[PDB]
Design a protein around this motif. Structure first.
Motif, PDB file in Angstrom:
ATOM      1  N   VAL A  63      -3.164 -10.554   1.412  1.00 35.80           N
ATOM      2  CA  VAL A  63      -3.871 -10.197   0.187  1.00 35.80           C
ATOM      3  C   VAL A  63      -5.029  -9.263   0.533  1.00 35.80           C
ATOM      4  CG1 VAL A  63      -3.143 -12.323  -0.916  1.00 35.80           C
ATOM      5  CG2 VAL A  63      -5.359 -12.245   0.233  1.00 35.80           C
ATOM      6  N   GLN A  64      -4.686  -8.116   1.116  1.00 38.94           N
ATOM      7  CA  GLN A  64      -5.671  -7.167   1.619  1.00 38.94           C
ATOM      8  C   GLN A  64      -6.517  -6.547   0.519  1.00 38.94           C
ATOM      9  OE1 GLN A  64      -2.044  -5.557   2.731  1.00 38.94           O
ATOM     10  NE2 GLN A  64      -2.537  -5.346   4.912  1.00 38.94           N
ATOM     11  N   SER A  65      -6.357  -6.983  -0.732  1.00 44.25           N
ATOM     12  CA  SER A  65      -7.297  -6.621  -1.783  1.00 44.25           C
ATOM     13  C   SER A  65      -8.708  -7.106  -1.486  1.00 44.25           C
ATOM     14  CB  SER A  65      -6.826  -7.199  -3.120  1.00 44.25           C
ATOM     15  OG  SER A  65      -6.213  -8.465  -2.933  1.00 44.25           O
ATOM     16  N   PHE A  66      -8.872  -8.012  -0.525  1.00 45.23           N
ATOM     17  CA  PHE A  66     -10.171  -8.575  -0.192  1.00 45.23           C
ATOM     18  C   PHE A  66     -10.782  -7.962   1.060  1.00 45.23           C
ATOM     19  CE2 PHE A  66      -8.526 -12.091  -2.851  1.00 45.23           C
ATOM     20  CZ  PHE A  66      -9.566 -12.118  -3.758  1.00 45.23           C
ATOM     21  N   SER A  67     -10.122  -6.978   1.665  1.00 44.07           N
ATOM     22  CA  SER A  67     -10.737  -6.235   2.754  1.00 44.07           C
ATOM     23  C   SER A  67     -12.068  -5.655   2.295  1.00 44.07           C
ATOM     24  CB  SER A  67      -9.813  -5.112   3.223  1.00 44.07           C
ATOM     25  OG  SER A  67      -8.532  -5.610   3.564  1.00 44.07           O
ATOM     26  N   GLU A 106       4.298 -10.374  -4.789  1.00 41.21           N
ATOM     27  CA  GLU A 106       3.581  -9.743  -5.889  1.00 41.21           C
ATOM     28  C   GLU A 106       2.143 -10.235  -5.843  1.00 41.21           C
ATOM     29  OE1 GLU A 106       5.020  -9.618  -9.824  1.00 41.21           O
ATOM     30  OE2 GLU A 106       7.071  -9.063  -9.280  1.00 41.21           O
ATOM     31  N   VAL A 107       1.211  -9.320  -5.604  1.00 44.80           N
ATOM     32  CA  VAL A 107      -0.212  -9.636  -5.568  1.00 44.80           C
ATOM     33  C   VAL A 107      -0.799  -9.184  -6.898  1.00 44.80           C
ATOM     34  CG1 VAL A 107      -2.289  -9.579  -4.174  1.00 44.80           C
ATOM     35  CG2 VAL A 107      -0.068  -9.132  -3.121  1.00 44.80           C
ATOM     36  N   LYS A 108      -1.190 -10.152  -7.723  1.00 45.67           N
ATOM     37  CA  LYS A 108      -1.476  -9.913  -9.129  1.00 45.67           C
ATOM     38  C   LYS A 108      -2.594 -10.839  -9.576  1.00 45.67           C
ATOM     39  CE  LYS A 108       1.516  -8.444 -12.956  1.00 45.67           C
ATOM     40  NZ  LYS A 108       2.813  -8.864 -13.560  1.00 45.67           N
ATOM     41  N   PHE A 109      -3.422 -10.348 -10.494  1.00 46.74           N
ATOM     42  CA  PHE A 109      -4.384 -11.209 -11.165  1.00 46.74           C
ATOM     43  C   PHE A 109      -3.675 -11.996 -12.258  1.00 46.74           C
ATOM     44  CE2 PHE A 109      -8.376  -9.256  -9.556  1.00 46.74           C
ATOM     45  CZ  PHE A 109      -9.089 -10.424  -9.383  1.00 46.74           C
ATOM     46  N   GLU A 110      -4.006 -13.281 -12.360  1.00 46.63           N
ATOM     47  CA  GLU A 110      -3.461 -14.169 -13.388  1.00 46.63           C
ATOM     48  C   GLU A 110      -4.654 -14.926 -13.964  1.00 46.63           C
ATOM     49  OE1 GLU A 110      -0.228 -16.583 -12.142  1.00 46.63           O
ATOM     50  OE2 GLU A 110       1.222 -14.932 -12.188  1.00 46.63           O
ATOM     51  N   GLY A 111      -5.286 -14.342 -14.976  1.00 46.32           N
ATOM     52  CA  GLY A 111      -6.534 -14.894 -15.473  1.00 46.32           C
ATOM     53  C   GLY A 111      -7.656 -14.591 -14.500  1.00 46.32           C
ATOM     54  N   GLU A 217     -10.763 -15.702   7.589  1.00 49.08           N
ATOM     55  CA  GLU A 217     -10.553 -14.327   8.010  1.00 49.08           C
ATOM     56  C   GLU A 217     -11.703 -13.444   7.558  1.00 49.08           C
ATOM     57  OE1 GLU A 217      -6.652 -13.447   6.310  1.00 49.08           O
ATOM     58  OE2 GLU A 217      -5.866 -13.338   8.359  1.00 49.08           O
ATOM     59  N   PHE A 218     -12.104 -12.527   8.433  1.00 46.04           N
ATOM     60  CA  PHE A 218     -13.049 -11.468   8.102  1.00 46.04           C
ATOM     61  C   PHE A 218     -12.349 -10.135   8.318  1.00 46.04           C
ATOM     62  CE2 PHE A 218     -15.888 -15.011   8.889  1.00 46.04           C
ATOM     63  CZ  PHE A 218     -16.790 -14.887   7.850  1.00 46.04           C
ATOM     64  N   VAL A 219     -12.244  -9.345   7.254  1.00 48.01           N
ATOM     65  CA  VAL A 219     -11.470  -8.110   7.253  1.00 48.01           C
ATOM     66  C   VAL A 219     -12.390  -6.952   6.901  1.00 48.01           C
ATOM     67  CG1 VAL A 219      -9.396  -6.964   6.393  1.00 48.01           C
ATOM     68  CG2 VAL A 219      -9.486  -9.465   6.488  1.00 48.01           C
TER      69      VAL A 219
END
Length: 224
Positions: A63-67, A106-111, A217-219
């Motif tokens: 979930v590299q959206s959090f890098s 699928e990496v997606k926001f759900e609420g 993890e720290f990215v």
């Protein structure tokens, strides 16, 4: 404006349904993410019994959206660019001299919650190799991953190799190849070539009896 949804602490749900040489299993992860500092903290549980796989071989997938993308580089963060509608993440992980994983997520926001729903299949694994034979130590050696734009798919590409330690003292290699495409039709940021570095820390909850894994993890993005 997708940068919006990662300012603070975003809760995470991770769902994975796996099938490796017919071994069906499933993992459920719960945690939170702080993209502005690049800190990931999750606890994954096997809702199926003991994993047929070593926990370390599933880190890449869960979930590299959090890098953390530095300010001087925020125009290359494809992962948050494609939110809230999300992106598809596909990987082929080929364990040298053994089977291969093929993931689709699928990496997606759900609420409020960012979700990564994954389906994994693995074939041609040796019934007692390093993977199915549980010969891999419980630790993880990260490795930089080279992000590249693939504009014909309006997305990004990357390949990288991971080394898992063997009880033997050997090293089981895992060749990653990665495709990511947006789900929505909106425009995304296609980045110049850069890197995503990671330090993972694997641990156990002493009060958890189910087969599980606590991941920290720290990215950071950089390059170069």
């Amino acid at each position: 404006k997708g940068e919006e949804l990662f300012t603070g602490v975003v809760p995470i749900l991770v769902e994975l349904d796996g099938d490796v040489n017919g071994h069906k299993f499933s993992v459920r992860g719960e945690g939170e993410g702080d993209a502005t500092n690049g800190k990931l903290t999750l606890k994954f549980i096997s809702t199926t019994g003991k994993l047929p796989v070593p926990w370390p071989t599933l880190v890449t997938t869960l979930v590299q959206s959090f890098s953390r993308y530095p300010d001087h580089m925020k125009r290359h963060d494809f992962f948050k660019s494609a939110m809230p509608e999300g992106y598809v993440q596909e990987r082929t992980i080929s364990f040298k001299d053994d089977g291969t994983y093929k993931t689709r997520a699928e990496v997606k926001f759900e609420g409020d919650t960012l979700v990564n729903r994954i389906e994994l299949k693995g074939i041609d694994f040796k019934e007692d190799g390093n993977i199915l034979g549980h010969k891999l130590e419980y630790n993880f050696n990260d490795h930089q991953v080279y992000i590249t734009a693939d504009k014909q798919k309006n997305g990004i590409k990357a390949n990288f190799k991971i080394r898992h330690n063997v009880e033997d003292g050997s090293v089981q290699l895992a060749d990653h190849y990665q495709q990511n495409t947006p789900i929505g039709d909106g425009p995304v940021l296609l980045p110049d070539n850069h890197y995503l570095f990671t330090t993972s820390t694997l641990s156990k909850d002493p009060n958890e009896k189910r087969d599980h894994m606590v991941l920290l993890e720290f990215v950071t993005a950089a390059g170069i």
